[PDB]
């Protein structure tokens, strides 16, 4: 008996089902670490990260909401992205879109 204990049913949850995804190789060319969140518009991340920005347009990291991926200086890695939904209007970030797409 543990007060307020959970009895979670075993298994897994599939995240962001039915959405377009794509994998890209990213390399941190800066001298300082860079960490990216699950819902950040990937195409507008820190310029020190080298990758195909054009492909990352309208995409974010396909990871659990609230988590992140970290890139230490010089680190190269392949990440999986998932397309934004809703109106697919991008506002903010580095100010490169500021409208639909």
């Amino acid at each position: 008996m543990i007060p307020g204990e959970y009895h979670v049913k075993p298994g897994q949850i599939a995240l962001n089902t039915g959405r377009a995804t794509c994998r890209v190789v990213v390399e941190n060319h800066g001298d300082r670490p860079i960490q990216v969140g699950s819902h950040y518009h990937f195409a507008e991340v820190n310029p020190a990260l080298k990758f195909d920005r054009q492909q990352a347009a309208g995409y974010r990291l396909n990871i659990p909401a609230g988590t992140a991926v970290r890139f230490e200086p010089g680190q190269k890695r392949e990440v999986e992205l998932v397309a934004f939904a809703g109106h697919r209007a991008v506002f903010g970030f580095r100010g490169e879109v500021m409208g639909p797409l």
């Binding site: 800066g30 300082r32 969140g37 820190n46 992140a68 970030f93 580095r94």
Partner: peptide, 10 residues
């Protein structure tokens, strides 16, 4: 802090 959108200079 994360340098997610850029570094201090940005």
């Amino acid at each position: 802090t994360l340098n997610e959108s850029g570094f201090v200079e940005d």
